C-alpha cells in the first residue's frame, strides 16, 4: 500500500526515506520518525512486499529481498538486492518530480532495509544528502570496485549506527561494512556509532543521534 509518512508540517523542502526492516512494516519506524520529526522535512517509511523467505522455508513475510543465510558467506539474492533497490530508485524519482531534489533526500533502513538504502545510495546517479544505515550491512560486498566508487555520492555522508549486543546482525557486521564504506566513498563523511547493551533494535541516544545528523545535512530554507 501507500508508504506511512511524516508529513512537514510546512512545506517539505527535505525527505528522509527510511526501509524498515525483515518482517515489518513502515508505521512503527514512521511513528518513530515523528518523535524527532523537523518541520520542514518530509518522513517516507515504504512497506516491504510479502515474499517468501527462502530461510524460512519460504514462508511468506514482509522482505526488501530474499533471504538464504544469515552467515556473510550465505549466498545472496543478487536479483532481488538489485531490483529492490531499482525499486527505491523510481520512490526518489517520484519526490524530485513532486519538488523535493534528490540532494536534499536522506536514504536509510534498518538491517534488511538499511542493507537496501546502503547499496542503493551507493549505485543510483542520484545525488544523495547521506544515509542513516542502522543495525545493517552491506549487500553484494564483492560486487563493488576496488577503489572509491566515484560518480554522483562519492562524498556522501553516511551516519551508521550498531548495537554491540546484536545476535542477529552482529556488531563486527557493521563494523566491517564501515570499513568498506571508508573505501567507497570519502571516509571523512562516515561514521560509526555503537550502542552498548543494545541487540537488534533501537535506542532513543541512537534516535536522537540520528536526528543530530538528518538536521545538519537537512537544515532549513
Ligand atoms: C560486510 C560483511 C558482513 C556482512 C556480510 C553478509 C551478511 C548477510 C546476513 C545478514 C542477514 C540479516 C537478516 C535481516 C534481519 C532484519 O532485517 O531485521
Same mark, same amino acid.
Given at each position: 500500500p501507500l508508504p *506511512?509518512? $511524516?508529513?512537514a508540517a510546512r512545506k517539505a523542502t527535505a525527505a528522509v526515506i527510511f526501509l524498515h526492516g525483515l518482517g515489518d512494516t513502515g508505521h512503527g519506524w514512521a511513528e518513530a520518525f *515523528?518523535?524527532?520529526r523537523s518541520s520542514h522535512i518530509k518522513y517516507i517509511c515504504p512497506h516491504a512486499p510479502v515474499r517468501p523467505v527462502t530461510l524460512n522455508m519460504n514462508v511468506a513475510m514482509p522482505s526488501w529481498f530474499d533471504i538464504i543465510g544469515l552467515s556473510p558467506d550465505s549466498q545472496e539474492?543478487?536479483?532481488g538486492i538489485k531490483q529492490a533497490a531499482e525499486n527505491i530508485k523510481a520512490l526518489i524519482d517520484q519526490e $524530485?518530480?513532486?519538488g523535493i531534489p534528490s540532494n536534499r533526500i536522506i536514504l536509510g533502513g534498518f538491517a534488511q532495509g538499511g542493507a537496501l538504502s546502503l547499496y542503493? *545510495?551507493?549505485?543510483? @546517479?542520484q545525488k544523495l544528502a547521506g544515509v542513516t544505515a542502522l543495525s545493517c550491512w552491506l549487500p553484494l560486498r564483492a560486487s563493488f570496485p576496488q577503489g572509491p566508487i566515484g560518480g554522483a555520492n562519492r562524498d556522501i555522508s553516511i551516519l551508521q549506527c550498531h548495537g554491540d549486543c546484536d545476535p542477529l546482525v552482529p556488531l563486527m557486521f557493521g563494523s566491517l561494512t564501515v570499513e568498506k564504506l571508508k573505501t567507497l566513498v570519502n571516509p571523512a563523511n562516515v561514521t560509526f556509532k555503537t550502542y552498548?547493551? #543494545? #541487540?537488534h533494535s533501537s535506542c @532513543? @541516544?541512537?534516535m536522537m543521534d540520528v536526528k543530530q545528523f538528518i538536521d545538519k545535512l537537512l537544515p532549513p530554507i
Open positions: *506511512a509518512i $511524516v508529513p *515523528a518523535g524527532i539474492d543478487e536479483s $524530485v518530480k513532486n542503493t *545510495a551507493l549505485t543510483t @546517479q552498548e547493551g #543494545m #541487540m @532513543q @541516544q541512537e
